[PDB]
Design an enzyme around this catalytic site. Structure first.
Site, PDB file in Angstrom:
ATOM      1  N   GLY A  21       0.852  -1.182   0.000  1.00 22.83           N
ATOM      2  CA  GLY A  21       0.000   0.000   0.000  1.00 22.83           C
ATOM      3  C   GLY A  21       0.887   1.232   0.000  1.00 22.83           C
ATOM      4  N   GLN A  22       0.333   2.357   0.441  1.00 15.40           N
ATOM      5  CA  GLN A  22       1.099   3.593   0.571  1.00 15.40           C
ATOM      6  C   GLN A  22       1.946   3.565   1.842  1.00 15.40           C
ATOM      7  OE1 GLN A  22      -2.099   6.815  -1.262  1.00 15.40           O
ATOM      8  NE2 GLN A  22      -2.605   5.759   0.656  1.00 15.40           N
ATOM      9  N   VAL A  26       4.041  -5.814   1.848  1.00 15.72           N
ATOM     10  CA  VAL A  26       3.759  -7.228   2.111  1.00 15.72           C
ATOM     11  C   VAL A  26       4.820  -8.124   1.478  1.00 15.72           C
ATOM     12  CG1 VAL A  26       2.019  -9.079   2.007  1.00 15.72           C
ATOM     13  CG2 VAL A  26       1.280  -6.697   2.183  1.00 15.72           C
ATOM     14  N   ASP A 138     -13.323  -1.634   1.917  1.00 11.09           N
ATOM     15  CA  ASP A 138     -12.334  -1.589   0.838  1.00 11.09           C
ATOM     16  C   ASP A 138     -12.504  -2.748  -0.152  1.00 11.09           C
ATOM     17  OD1 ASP A 138     -10.278  -0.215  -0.476  1.00 11.09           O
ATOM     18  OD2 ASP A 138      -8.684  -1.289   0.583  1.00 11.09           O
ATOM     19  N   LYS A 140     -12.814  -4.404  -3.429  1.00 12.99           N
ATOM     20  CA  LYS A 140     -12.422  -4.159  -4.816  1.00 12.99           C
ATOM     21  C   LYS A 140     -11.635  -5.367  -5.342  1.00 12.99           C
ATOM     22  CE  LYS A 140      -8.298  -1.532  -3.447  1.00 12.99           C
ATOM     23  NZ  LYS A 140      -7.499  -0.294  -3.674  1.00 12.99           N
ATOM     24  N   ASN A 143      -8.529  -6.656  -3.741  1.00 14.45           N
ATOM     25  CA  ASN A 143      -8.700  -7.294  -2.436  1.00 14.45           C
ATOM     26  C   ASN A 143      -9.509  -8.597  -2.483  1.00 14.45           C
ATOM     27  OD1 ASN A 143      -7.147  -5.240  -1.245  1.00 14.45           O
ATOM     28  ND2 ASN A 143      -8.954  -3.981  -0.813  1.00 14.45           N
ATOM     29  N   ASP A 160      -6.801  -7.430   3.021  1.00 19.83           N
ATOM     30  CA  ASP A 160      -6.605  -6.001   3.307  1.00 19.83           C
ATOM     31  C   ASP A 160      -7.741  -5.374   4.118  1.00 19.83           C
ATOM     32  OD1 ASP A 160      -5.616  -3.412   3.462  1.00 19.83           O
ATOM     33  OD2 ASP A 160      -5.355  -3.156   1.302  1.00 19.83           O
ATOM     34  N   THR A 179     -10.926   3.604  -2.748  1.00 20.91           N
ATOM     35  CA  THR A 179     -10.701   3.896  -4.159  1.00 20.91           C
ATOM     36  C   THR A 179     -11.991   4.443  -4.771  1.00 20.91           C
ATOM     37  OG1 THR A 179      -9.133   2.043  -4.221  1.00 20.91           O
ATOM     38  CG2 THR A 179      -9.798   2.989  -6.339  1.00 20.91           C
TER      39      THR A 179
END
Length: 303
Positions: A21-22, A26, A138, A140, A143, A160, A179
């Protein structure tokens, strides 16, 4: 219990990067003691408050608290938690089968019956969360992962939980995250959030799964947000010519602005498209196909 203050590297072999991620990274890992493989999520900690880099103590502890609760065959399982000076490291179930959308793009054909099977897997995972008053927030294609891409019908794992939140009785939860393409209007409008937001996201994922097209995605973020808030989407015949009516009804009942009107996870599982009432509707679903040409095209464009 307390986070382990011992060095991760002292107890774990560290392998390849799986993603990031930001604020997190991982990596594939193996516990030296057992010889078992896991995934190590390295989350950078904030310095104080006004830091541009790092995740807050509260947000880290929330994710851990939620992951420690969940034990379901459609949801990632937590193994252990470590903490050093820079990072809090989550030792998670190794999921290595890649994204569902990647696997689907690989198939020579896909029926709506097959599609619903994968969708039900997600619905089963979300149901388990929603029963425990946990919203994922989250949902999407990124994920939506698989364990093994080499079995006939791969098993889905929801991953996630960085934005996951426990819904409290009578407590108003308002935040802007996720997102843009996949977020519900209540997120965009800065309105009270709940389990309903997840159901909208499922509607968006289903839409893309069946067509390859995205319902609200515009040229810019500005356009995307305008489409979501006005609930402006279509079932264009360019992308939805093969689609059954019940599939469209399933989505139509999920992409609703009014949270009280939107289908609950239980209502989604009962829906005739997921759950046929007779052999006729089962056969209609069996014969209906997804244009993988369009799905594949758009997925590669996401690469």
């Amino acid at each position: 219990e307390p986070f382990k203050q011992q060095k991760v590297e002292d107890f774990y072999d560290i392998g390849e990067e799986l993603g990031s991620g930001q604020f997190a990274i991982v990596k594939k890992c193996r516990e030296k003691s057992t010889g078992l493989e896991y995934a190590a999520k390295f989350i950078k900690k904030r310095q104080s408050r006004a830091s541009r880099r790092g995740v807050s103590r509260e947000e880290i502890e929330r994710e851990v608290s939620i992951l420690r609760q969940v034990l379901h065959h459609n949801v990632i399982t937590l193994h252990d938690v470590y903490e050093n000076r820079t990072d809090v490291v989550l030792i998670l179930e190794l999921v290595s089968g890649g994204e569902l959308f990647d696997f689907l793009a690989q198939k020579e054909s896909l029926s709506e019956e097959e599609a619903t099977s994968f969708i039900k897997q997600i619905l089963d995972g979300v149901n388990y969360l929603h029963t425990k008053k946990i919203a994922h927030f989250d949902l999407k294609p990124e994920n939506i992962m698989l364990l093994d891409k080499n079995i006939p019908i791969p098993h889905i794992k929801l991953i996630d939980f960085g934005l996951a939140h426990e819904i409290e009785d009578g407590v108003e939860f308002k935040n802007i995250f996720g997102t843009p393409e996949f977020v519900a209007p209540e997120i965009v409008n800065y309105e009270p959030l709940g389990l309903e937001a997840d159901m909208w996201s499922i509607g968006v994922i289903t839409y893309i799964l069946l067509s390859g097209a995205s319902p609200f995605l515009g040229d810019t973020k500005q356009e995307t947000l305008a489409n979501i808030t006005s609930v402006s989407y279509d079932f264009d015949e360019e992308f939805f010519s093969h689609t059954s009516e019940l599939a469209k009804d399933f989505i139509r009942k999920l992409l609703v602005k009014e949270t009280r009107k939107r289908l609950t996870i239980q209502e989604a599982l009962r829906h005739p498209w997921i759950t046929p009432v007779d052999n006729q509707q089962a056969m209609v679903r069996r014969e209906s196909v997804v244009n993988l040409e369009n799905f594949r095209k758009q997925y590669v464009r996401r690469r």
